[PDB]
Design an enzyme around this catalytic site. Structure first.
Site, PDB file in Angstrom:
ATOM      1  NE  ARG A 103       4.595  27.111  -6.697  1.00 56.29           N
ATOM      2  CZ  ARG A 103       3.801  26.837  -7.735  1.00 56.29           C
ATOM      3  NH1 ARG A 103       3.824  25.648  -8.337  1.00 56.29           N
ATOM      4  NH2 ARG A 103       2.960  27.769  -8.175  1.00 56.29           N
TER       5      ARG A 103
ATOM      6  CG  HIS B  29      19.900   8.826  -6.704  1.00 57.93           C
ATOM      7  ND1 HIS B  29      20.287  10.107  -7.032  1.00 57.93           N
ATOM      8  CD2 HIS B  29      18.967   8.468  -7.618  1.00 57.93           C
ATOM      9  CE1 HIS B  29      19.600  10.516  -8.082  1.00 57.93           C
ATOM     10  NE2 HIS B  29      18.789   9.542  -8.455  1.00 57.93           N
TER      11      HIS B  29
ATOM     12  CG  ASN C 245      -1.974   1.120   1.092  1.00 55.22           C
ATOM     13  OD1 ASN C 245      -2.785   1.108   0.177  1.00 55.22           O
ATOM     14  ND2 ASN C 245      -1.949   2.072   2.003  1.00 55.22           N
TER      15      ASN C 245
ATOM     16  CG  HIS D 231      21.301   9.428 -11.135  1.00 50.74           C
ATOM     17  ND1 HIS D 231      21.082  10.778 -11.309  1.00 50.74           N
ATOM     18  CD2 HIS D 231      20.404   8.799 -11.929  1.00 50.74           C
ATOM     19  CE1 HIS D 231      20.108  10.956 -12.184  1.00 50.74           C
ATOM     20  NE2 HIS D 231      19.680   9.769 -12.577  1.00 50.74           N
TER      21      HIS D 231
ATOM     22  CG  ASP E   7       9.447  14.900  -5.283  1.00 46.74           C
ATOM     23  OD1 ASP E   7       9.681  13.884  -4.598  1.00 46.74           O
ATOM     24  OD2 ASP E   7      10.202  15.261  -6.212  1.00 46.74           O
TER      25      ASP E   7
ATOM     26  CG  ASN F 265      -3.089  18.086 -20.569  1.00 44.91           C
ATOM     27  OD1 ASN F 265      -3.304  19.175 -20.030  1.00 44.91           O
ATOM     28  ND2 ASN F 265      -4.051  17.191 -20.784  1.00 44.91           N
TER      29      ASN F 265
ATOM     30  NE  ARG G 180      12.865  18.024 -15.226  1.00 46.02           N
ATOM     31  CZ  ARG G 180      13.831  18.828 -15.680  1.00 46.02           C
ATOM     32  NH1 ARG G 180      13.545  19.969 -16.306  1.00 46.02           N
ATOM     33  NH2 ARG G 180      15.098  18.492 -15.495  1.00 46.02           N
TER      34      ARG G 180
ATOM     35  CG  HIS H  21      13.642  27.052  -0.694  1.00 50.36           C
ATOM     36  ND1 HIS H  21      14.456  27.461   0.337  1.00 50.36           N
ATOM     37  CD2 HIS H  21      12.491  27.752  -0.567  1.00 50.36           C
ATOM     38  CE1 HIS H  21      13.821  28.358   1.069  1.00 50.36           C
ATOM     39  NE2 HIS H  21      12.624  28.552   0.543  1.00 50.36           N
TER      40      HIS H  21
HETATM   41  N1  LIG Z   1       3.210  26.145  -0.933  1.00 47.78           N
HETATM   42  C1  LIG Z   1       4.410  26.727  -1.134  1.00 47.78           C
HETATM   43  N2  LIG Z   1       5.347  26.616  -0.161  1.00 47.78           N
HETATM   44  C2  LIG Z   1       6.567  27.181  -0.312  1.00 47.78           C
HETATM   45  C3  LIG Z   1       6.869  27.918  -1.538  1.00 47.78           C
HETATM   46  N3  LIG Z   1       8.132  28.365  -1.416  1.00 47.78           N
HETATM   47  C4  LIG Z   1       8.594  27.962  -0.202  1.00 47.78           C
HETATM   48  N4  LIG Z   1       7.655  27.244   0.439  1.00 47.78           N
HETATM   49  C5  LIG Z   1       7.721  26.643   1.781  1.00 47.78           C
HETATM   50  C6  LIG Z   1       9.101  26.237   2.269  1.00 47.78           C
HETATM   51  C7  LIG Z   1       9.024  26.563   3.743  1.00 47.78           C
HETATM   52  O1  LIG Z   1       8.492  25.458   4.477  1.00 47.78           O
HETATM   53  C8  LIG Z   1       8.042  27.716   3.849  1.00 47.78           C
HETATM   54  C9  LIG Z   1       8.742  29.064   3.933  1.00 47.78           C
HETATM   55  O2  LIG Z   1       9.544  29.235   2.776  1.00 47.78           O
HETATM   56  P1  LIG Z   1       9.953  30.694   2.254  1.00 47.78           P
HETATM   57  O3  LIG Z   1      10.790  30.494   1.030  1.00 47.78           O
HETATM   58  O4  LIG Z   1       8.708  31.545   2.187  1.00 47.78           O
HETATM   59  O5  LIG Z   1      10.845  31.225   3.496  1.00 47.78           O
HETATM   60  P2  LIG Z   1      12.368  31.767   3.479  1.00 47.78           P
HETATM   61  O6  LIG Z   1      12.791  31.906   4.906  1.00 47.78           O
HETATM   62  O7  LIG Z   1      13.181  30.951   2.522  1.00 47.78           O
HETATM   63  O8  LIG Z   1      12.224  33.241   2.835  1.00 47.78           O
HETATM   64  P3  LIG Z   1      12.468  34.641   3.626  1.00 47.78           P
HETATM   65  O9  LIG Z   1      13.384  34.343   4.789  1.00 47.78           O
HETATM   66  O10 LIG Z   1      11.074  35.054   4.021  1.00 47.78           O
HETATM   67  O11 LIG Z   1      13.092  35.480   2.538  1.00 47.78           O
HETATM   68  O12 LIG Z   1       7.235  27.649   2.677  1.00 47.78           O
HETATM   69  C10 LIG Z   1       5.790  27.988  -2.548  1.00 47.78           C
HETATM   70  O13 LIG Z   1       5.960  28.587  -3.621  1.00 47.78           O
HETATM   71  N5  LIG Z   1       4.629  27.383  -2.288  1.00 47.78           N
HETATM   72  N1  LIG Z   2      -5.203   0.387   2.971  1.00 46.94           N
HETATM   73  C1  LIG Z   2      -4.855  -0.601   3.820  1.00 46.94           C
HETATM   74  N2  LIG Z   2      -3.587  -1.068   3.732  1.00 46.94           N
HETATM   75  C2  LIG Z   2      -3.186  -2.063   4.566  1.00 46.94           C
HETATM   76  C3  LIG Z   2      -4.110  -2.624   5.549  1.00 46.94           C
HETATM   77  N3  LIG Z   2      -3.440  -3.586   6.211  1.00 46.94           N
HETATM   78  C4  LIG Z   2      -2.192  -3.640   5.697  1.00 46.94           C
HETATM   79  N4  LIG Z   2      -2.053  -2.716   4.728  1.00 46.94           N
HETATM   80  C5  LIG Z   2      -0.890  -2.447   3.869  1.00 46.94           C
HETATM   81  C6  LIG Z   2       0.464  -2.768   4.474  1.00 46.94           C
HETATM   82  C7  LIG Z   2       1.216  -3.321   3.275  1.00 46.94           C
HETATM   83  O1  LIG Z   2       1.857  -2.251   2.571  1.00 46.94           O
HETATM   84  C8  LIG Z   2       0.164  -3.926   2.366  1.00 46.94           C
HETATM   85  C9  LIG Z   2       0.076  -5.428   2.544  1.00 46.94           C
HETATM   86  O2  LIG Z   2      -0.235  -5.718   3.902  1.00 46.94           O
HETATM   87  P1  LIG Z   2      -0.948  -7.082   4.315  1.00 46.94           P
HETATM   88  O3  LIG Z   2      -1.164  -7.031   5.789  1.00 46.94           O
HETATM   89  O4  LIG Z   2      -2.107  -7.299   3.376  1.00 46.94           O
HETATM   90  O5  LIG Z   2       0.190  -8.155   3.929  1.00 46.94           O
HETATM   91  P2  LIG Z   2       0.892  -9.289   4.842  1.00 46.94           P
HETATM   92  O6  LIG Z   2       2.064  -9.779   4.049  1.00 46.94           O
HETATM   93  O7  LIG Z   2       1.090  -8.755   6.236  1.00 46.94           O
HETATM   94  O8  LIG Z   2      -0.213 -10.449   4.940  1.00 46.94           O
HETATM   95  P3  LIG Z   2      -0.181 -11.922   4.260  1.00 46.94           P
HETATM   96  O9  LIG Z   2       1.271 -12.308   4.074  1.00 46.94           O
HETATM   97  O10 LIG Z   2      -0.949 -11.732   2.983  1.00 46.94           O
HETATM   98  O11 LIG Z   2      -0.955 -12.753   5.247  1.00 46.94           O
HETATM   99  O12 LIG Z   2      -1.073  -3.295   2.723  1.00 46.94           O
HETATM  100  C10 LIG Z   2      -5.471  -2.053   5.574  1.00 46.94           C
HETATM  101  O13 LIG Z   2      -6.313  -2.485   6.387  1.00 46.94           O
HETATM  102  N5  LIG Z   2      -5.758  -1.072   4.708  1.00 46.94           N
HETATM  103  N1  LIG Z   3      -7.976  15.572 -16.518  1.00 43.75           N
HETATM  104  C1  LIG Z   3      -8.300  16.102 -17.715  1.00 43.75           C
HETATM  105  N2  LIG Z   3      -9.514  15.802 -18.238  1.00 43.75           N
HETATM  106  C2  LIG Z   3      -9.883  16.314 -19.439  1.00 43.75           C
HETATM  107  C3  LIG Z   3      -8.963  17.179 -20.177  1.00 43.75           C
HETATM  108  N3  LIG Z   3      -9.583  17.524 -21.323  1.00 43.75           N
HETATM  109  C4  LIG Z   3     -10.800  16.923 -21.317  1.00 43.75           C
HETATM  110  N4  LIG Z   3     -10.971  16.217 -20.186  1.00 43.75           N
HETATM  111  C5  LIG Z   3     -12.123  15.389 -19.784  1.00 43.75           C
HETATM  112  C6  LIG Z   3     -13.476  15.840 -20.308  1.00 43.75           C
HETATM  113  C7  LIG Z   3     -14.165  14.520 -20.601  1.00 43.75           C
HETATM  114  O1  LIG Z   3     -14.873  14.066 -19.438  1.00 43.75           O
HETATM  115  C8  LIG Z   3     -13.051  13.533 -20.903  1.00 43.75           C
HETATM  116  C9  LIG Z   3     -12.852  13.336 -22.403  1.00 43.75           C
HETATM  117  O2  LIG Z   3     -12.553  14.588 -22.998  1.00 43.75           O
HETATM  118  P1  LIG Z   3     -11.769  14.675 -24.395  1.00 43.75           P
HETATM  119  O3  LIG Z   3     -11.622  16.135 -24.721  1.00 43.75           O
HETATM  120  O4  LIG Z   3     -10.538  13.815 -24.331  1.00 43.75           O
HETATM  121  O5  LIG Z   3     -12.775  13.915 -25.400  1.00 43.75           O
HETATM  122  P2  LIG Z   3     -13.486  14.514 -26.713  1.00 43.75           P
HETATM  123  O6  LIG Z   3     -14.551  13.509 -27.069  1.00 43.75           O
HETATM  124  O7  LIG Z   3     -13.843  15.955 -26.494  1.00 43.75           O
HETATM  125  O8  LIG Z   3     -12.319  14.476 -27.826  1.00 43.75           O
HETATM  126  P3  LIG Z   3     -12.265  13.445 -29.070  1.00 43.75           P
HETATM  127  O9  LIG Z   3     -13.686  13.075 -29.417  1.00 43.75           O
HETATM  128  O10 LIG Z   3     -11.434  12.312 -28.548  1.00 43.75           O
HETATM  129  O11 LIG Z   3     -11.577  14.274 -30.132  1.00 43.75           O
HETATM  130  O12 LIG Z   3     -11.876  14.069 -20.294  1.00 43.75           O
HETATM  131  C10 LIG Z   3      -7.659  17.448 -19.537  1.00 43.75           C
HETATM  132  O13 LIG Z   3      -6.821  18.181 -20.102  1.00 43.75           O
HETATM  133  N5  LIG Z   3      -7.406  16.889 -18.342  1.00 43.75           N
END
Ligand SMILES: Nc1nc2c(ncn2[C@H]2C[C@H](O)[C@@H](COP(=O)(O)OP(=O)(O)OP(=O)(O)O)O2)c(=O)[nH]1
Ligand SMILES: Nc1nc2c(ncn2[C@H]2C[C@H](O)[C@@H](COP(=O)(O)OP(=O)(O)OP(=O)(O)O)O2)c(=O)[nH]1
Ligand SMILES: Nc1nc2c(ncn2[C@H]2C[C@H](O)[C@@H](COP(=O)(O)OP(=O)(O)OP(=O)(O)O)O2)c(=O)[nH]1
Ligand SMILES: Nc1nc2c(ncn2[C@H]2C[C@H](O)[C@@H](COP(=O)(O)OP(=O)(O)OP(=O)(O)O)O2)c(=O)[nH]1
Lengths: 481, 481, 481, 481
Positions: free
Chosen positions: A254, A98, A7, A121, A201, A240, A248, A258
């Site tokens: 960000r 790595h 899992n 790597h 990430d 897309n 990337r 950093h």
């Molecule tokens: N969601 C998000 N988090 C970011 C971004 N850039 C940095 N972070 C995270 C990393 C840190 O856990 C937290 C603070 O990072 P900052 O770059 O704002 O602080 P820093 O001390 O580097 O800048 P400063 O001292 O204020 O010039 O936010 C971003 O663009 N988006």
């Molecule tokens: N989502 C979810 N993941 C679980 C649960 N129990 C265990 N896992 C995770 C941990 C492992 O990454 C993966 C497989 O765990 P399992 O307990 O099914 O395998 P295990 O080898 O312990 O049992 P087995 O050798 O089949 O008797 O699933 C659960 O209840 N829910």
């Molecule tokens: N996640 C995601 N979904 C999209 C995007 N564009 C369209 N969708 C959704 C809308 C629809 O529920 C489904 C199919 O849309 P499409 O534009 O691929 O099919 P459409 O029949 O319009 O094009 P086609 O007949 O294949 O030329 O995906 C996208 O860029 N990202």
């Protein structure tokens, strides 16, 4: 032996074939548990505790998803179970090479510690994979499950590092060319490794991921291109694909680049360099290696992980004092001070050979400002970052093949103009960050003056905070305002 | 100097007051980066790479959220900025005392290595906090931001470990009693520490969290109860509170008590015990401690983290061969084999003093099955797990106070029948897992026969796979058929 | 009366002041439950079932979050509870003016049905707000909670539609200028309305949102700019601000301008036009209005929602047969056929006046390719989409003020070159989609030939599938080759 | 014609076979776009805008996932493409029979409007499916893709409603019995319909879902049970299966049975009953039906959706005044007042036939309290809710078959004692909610006194707020104290 289910928070339940489990349950693979994916990034984003091990499982999983999907849609490709397993193994094992703190090791430490050697790597991964196979009797297991070790080990290595040297591959023929585009795509960089790290990430960093790999897989097909069978994307997905590279770049901006994460990586690297003569790693035949030479012996390299950071930090030997003190300063968050960022203007690019001359240049600038302290070359760090779409100057989408719904077996090309005028006009740039090793208030003030003066002298871009940090300097440059 | 913002995947942007930053940026706090939250769980759930450090930030954050919300809604409580800071610091520092691999250290290793001593992570946290304050000149900083160190350090420690010995607390008076219910709630276990680990562990494990802490905060109020001011929940949230403990039980069942996670923890503990005579940790005055005695000296304990695992694994000393070999077997996934699980029936409860007699009991059983191999007491591990709602036999909701919309200042009680007849009738049970140290097919078959026979002999519950693993034993027991 | 808590999937628990609840619980506000946020988008993305009502709650919530955060960080702004409530009310009520299927109504239907009138949802929102206030006795309630209706109703309307006409606003003075930047930002488009729809639309569409509004709020400050107090962003956030507009563009590209969603919107609009003479909506004084004239009477407009679609679809009146049949064809998915997309090149821009002439041009083109069928102007639909960063040609980031860490009260400017050379060179473009009303295979083939020929004749961009759909035509245009 | 991909927020990209698309693109299927999944729930949880249509797509998708996974793991089952399509079609079409506001229609309106008839959504779905097939020429399309309409239409209907009335099914034989356990599981209720609504409702409600359907699929197998091939779950998943039903109960408690959502559903139902004589729905042959009789004619029923609510709300007909006024009161949030909740004790159960007598009983109670107003039977609403695990008193896990790792082809049973002692001891209970139609303060006070007195008189449980709302009544009952 039977299949195992793991899992994963990103992918949910991943099924692992018994052969894959055998490869995973080795010292060479389990080693990846002890190497952080984002290295120093953890010290800025506390969520980014994730290691190369779980990333590797995800890459193997996605490699299997893509090869399986292609086979199911196009039985004519003759994709085999053997092919699927080999692709999964390559996906699983392409991060084996790595080193401590990931990119820091190949990106910063080895280039400085061993400038003569060339190291990647990818090469490390091939060497480790060979070591893994040979040390754990994997070849017999491969034949048990229908693999042919000679051809298939070659194929797996080729997926990781490319041709081991007209069709350049020996593991598979031209008809199966598309298989080489899954794990590490040398043609345009669109591969499953990126797809896992985007999602993983983002999950850990606490930033959302805009790229939909599942959609890509659904729209992927294999078509003939220049007498090769290659993976082609549906034409409408071109936007897309541009966005994938945009994502990337945004992750680099960000998180991965950093300013503080980078300086921490820089400080750790300096600590490693200073510790290098004194840390010992026991390799094959009991022989001793250094951090910088463990790459020569895989038995030694197997035991070279993030732990070295703690070995240094916890050390008492006086020989390790300088290295240890650097790491201790990281803990106290007495870091080198960020002075600012700038970029070159126009055509001009900064060469790798010139990087060393840059600190001297900053120290040489003569800001017309009264300064309490005089700073020297050694007080400055200049970090140059190359930001691009993975192919230097080139547009990777020029190296993608597409197909259209009216003729799904006919490969076509799409140009940038055909898409959007809002897309990048360039695909590479440079960021220059400057730091000061002297952290006192007077020193930092002086560093800011030298820095902004240097920017002006060189006609680099005006630092965003230039008018605040250097109000006396910014006025002189007319272009700035 | 100024406040810092940290981006956390669970909580998003967390603001840290400068005082909090000073406390965080110390060797004593940063140590938590090197201790996995879920210990051996990472070896079963690859997402669970998270460490105590990021959990600690989240606990401090949530502690601040709750105290802030209460103060904003009820100005009459006279909650002060000083109070808010002290609650945040306690939330931040209540995990300082954890040892390598978290629960494994306090739950398994120390009880075996030092049976005479009574050690808890809570006590450890208080000791480490004192060491942190004294080693890093924190007291002056506290005064600078308006704290009174004598009273406030006492208050912080009391929040972590309870009374340091009629109102038993010295850090704050009865009119601020509710403040002690935030970080570590000794009354009913409803505290912000649980709320962070529910969300964080779920995020990393890949299991979804059903408890809404934000809703709880919104519905929380302070009311007078038995001449104390205590946190009360809206009546109507009672179902959600039952569900909070249900969520905790489910996390234990799926993840924390995973049979393989537990056995890996057990093997690591055995390795540590075998290494204990030979690993040295340098403490105060250059003096040397053992893994088991580092708890006596905080300077030594500061350097006692998950690194020890790798120190053993990477060692070459012949004295460490036995310890090293255990860890190497973990890497090869040559783990002790899970035999099965059972539970006591009726009123039967298994006492802690009796745990050591259990392996002998299993080995003593006489299954009527032909066995090529005979197993001994030492070949069995019997792991007894106490699953409860955090108060042994008691229903924690009997120790919650509620309020109703028509009278928000009047505390009331709600009984289980007033809620749902589908809720648990009992709040504690025991799970008994049996493993075998001999991993060969014949040994495992034999172990299954002894195990099921033992279950029948004790009138424990029929193992779920009993008819498959022991078809010749299961028929004998009438109660099972 | 007391505050109410609403649980929202995007924002979690939203607290609504009693005054806000009174405004919400009216026919004029509850009407928004019956208008889809993304109109025809639901017919392409089945997740996009969400309505304007829940969006409005989210906008009100975020407006409160931003104003509250600014006030808490900068008490000197003198932001008042009265100010907070007025900002929340404006945020809540800025979507009141939307009509059936949202953008389709103001974007497509009204411009065709009533070309003489200038109608916007903003104007509609002000009119509906006035109707809401007057019809439900809100003014007394406003006074009860400390609002001054004359000044504050003016302030609220101004936030929604801008100056109602040197400081142009009457609701608040220049010192509170920043308040006008929260709900609908006329200066640069950075407002809380975008932030809610990014998150909400993404949640429902099944597309991830990469803009972090909470971060933005945390880094927002108010600084003096040209003798106004305005919201300024931290300098570092500039990349994220560029990305906010990138996210908007991507949502338009993937979802809002989806080629099929647009054609469905087109068909629904045509149905509404054909129904317009016959549907009656009863307004004030029992007077009857048409779909196109309900905008003249708010009592009538209150009853004009997506319901009209079903009224037409379920009708039996022979007069409505033509309108009804169009909607029935939508249900059978007998939609007009997408032929392709192109863009103008060079300086060329397509004016609104020239849109009809476009279908005729396509029909007029002579391919030089034999055709079984001849198509006419009426068989083509040409849909022109203006894609931009919200300020036509302009870069909105040129209209953002920033501050730097070393001087948080000093507003600065940041230019595009100071950020990244990978950013857009242009901030506006046009997409041209062509469809054919004849859906048979021969007609579609013919439509493709006319279309590509037209593109070549106009020097528009080569359609992405041009070489497949029109292999004869593509070679002729040298520019394409 | 070719396969279509739909992007769904819950499931991501869903592939639809051409036959499935033909079925979906009909008036009978598209109708589900206009019926809210949670009915009145939307008026309490603003996120719950989702409709039956998107739920149906998800159910069809998951049905395909399960049948396909079983076939891939166990080729010996001989699952055919024809089988897969039939299972998908049943999954897609099992919600066709829902009426306006979903459960409100079958749960509240029809039982009151047509007490003589026995109506279920399942029966409705079969009737609508037949109408869909016959009205849209589907049978030829089925044959084109390899289906045999006579047998397969029977099979599809049987999956939806059960035996159409020793093996009772005609669509498939005993060796394909497991196929009937996918879409609507009559044996134990574990089916893909639940799995979709858990995930989808949670996504929209803003409450998290803790059941992992993907895991279940991975661990599902088919084994022989009593001469039938049935779906079996892995033994260790038993805890997760109990939790699945716990999740269902929690969704009912938090959302589906929300006290205000229920009263809104009650008010809407009353409005429909008052409108029933006057609303006309045109059916086959132009004949007119009522809301209550549209179920008799599928052509009429096709046009019976949530729109009826708006038709009533927007009406001007004096005959509809009473119905219209109720809906208008909902808009003003002038709802009947919640008085409280209680439960029966001991063996006591409340029969459907007795529901009518309950309001009279409450009004008849004589609280020994002085009251300004006297309330009558008609002033009270008593809503009785049956909360269970889907099989009345029975434990559904007693009707689940499991398999063990050592013998994956051998079906076993697991009892509750074998699992956890913290699980429910009962699997059904009743909740009784009381409301008052008089909303004034004096009336509400009186209603509370009657209510609590009634509870006491009947030995029902003490209301949670009883001591606050009726301090003079609660002391009287000794059992409560
Ligand atoms: N969601 C998000 N988090 C970011 C971004 N850039 C940095 N972070 C995270 C990393 C840190 O856990 C937290 C603070 O990072 P900052 O770059 O704002 O602080 P820093 O001390 O580097 O800048 P400063 O001292 O204020 O010039 O936010 C971003 O663009 N988006
Ligand atoms: N989502 C979810 N993941 C679980 C649960 N129990 C265990 N896992 C995770 C941990 C492992 O990454 C993966 C497989 O765990 P399992 O307990 O099914 O395998 P295990 O080898 O312990 O049992 P087995 O050798 O089949 O008797 O699933 C659960 O209840 N829910
Ligand atoms: N996640 C995601 N979904 C999209 C995007 N564009 C369209 N969708 C959704 C809308 C629809 O529920 C489904 C199919 O849309 P499409 O534009 O691929 O099919 P459409 O029949 O319009 O094009 P086609 O007949 O294949 O030329 O995906 C996208 O860029 N990202
Ligand atoms: N997340 C979550 N939301 C809930 C739960 N119960 C109700 N909600 C949602 C529905 C509403 O949008 C919002 C407020 O519902 P409440 O039941 O707390 O308010 P209500 O007015 O029914 O109760 P009250 O008037 O305070 O007695 O919270 C729950 O258990 N969890």
């Amino acid at each position: 032996d039977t299949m195992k289910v793991i899992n994963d928070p990103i992918h949910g339940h991943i099924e692992l074939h018994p052969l894959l489990v055998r490869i995973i349950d080795t010292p060479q693979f389990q080693r990846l548990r002890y190497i952080k994916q984002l290295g120093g990034g953890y010290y800025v984003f506390p969520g980014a505790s994730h290691n190369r091990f779980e990333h590797s499982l995800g890459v193997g999983y996605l490699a299997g998803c893509l090869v399986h999907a292609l086979g199911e849609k196009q039985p004519e490709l003759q994709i085999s179970e053997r092919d699927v397993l080999c692709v999964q193994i390559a996906g699983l094992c392409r991060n084996l090479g790595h080193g401590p703190f990931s990119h820091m090791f190949d990106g910063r430490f080895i280039p400085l510690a061993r400038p003569e050697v060339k190291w990647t790597h990818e090469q490390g991964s091939v060497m480790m994979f060979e070591h893994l196979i040979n040390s754990n009797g994997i070849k017999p297991v491969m034949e048990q499950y229908g693999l042919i070790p000679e051809e298939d080990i070659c194929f797996i290595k080729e997926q990781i590092v490319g041709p081991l040297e007209l069709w350049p591959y020996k593991g598979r023929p031209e008809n199966k060319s598309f298989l080489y585009e899954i794990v590490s795509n040398k043609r345009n960089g669109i591969d499953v490794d990126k797809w896992d790290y985007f999602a993983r990430d983002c999950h850990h960093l606490g930033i959302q991921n805009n790229f939909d790999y599942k959609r890509f897989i659904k729209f992927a097909r294999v078509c003939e291109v220049d007498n090769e069978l290659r993976i082609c994307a549906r034409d409408k997905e071109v936007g897309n694909l541009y966005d994938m590279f945009h994502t990337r770049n945004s992750l680099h901006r960000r998180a991965y680049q950093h300013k503080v994460g980078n300086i921490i990586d820089t400080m750790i690297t300096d600590a490693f360099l200073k510790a290098d003569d004194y840390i010992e790693i026991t390799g094959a035949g009991g022989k001793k290696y250094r951090i910088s030479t463990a790459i020569d012996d895989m038995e030694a390299y197997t035991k070279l992980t993030d732990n070295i950071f703690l070995e240094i930090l916890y050390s008492t030997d006086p020989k390790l004092k300088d290295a240890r003190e650097i790491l201790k300063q990281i803990e106290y968050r007495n870091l080198f001070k960020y002075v600012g960022e700038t970029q070159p203007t126009g055509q001009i690019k900064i060469k790798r050979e010139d990087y060393e001359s840059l600190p001297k240049e900053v120290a040489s600038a003569k800001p017309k400002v009264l300064l309490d302290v005089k700073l020297k070359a050694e007080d400055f760090i200049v970090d140059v970052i190359n930001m691009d779409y993975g192919m230097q100057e080139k547009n990777p989408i020029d190296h993608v093949s597409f197909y259209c719904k009216t003729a799904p077996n006919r490969a076509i090309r799409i140009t940038k103009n055909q898409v959007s005028q809002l897309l990048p006009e360039k695909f590479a740039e440079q960021l220059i960050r400057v730091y000061c090793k002297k952290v006192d208030r007077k020193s930092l003030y002086a560093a800011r003056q030298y820095f902004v003066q240097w920017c002006a002298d060189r006609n680099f871009t005006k630092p965003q905070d230039g008018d605040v940090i250097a109000p006396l300097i910014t006025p002189q440059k007319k272009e700035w305002n």
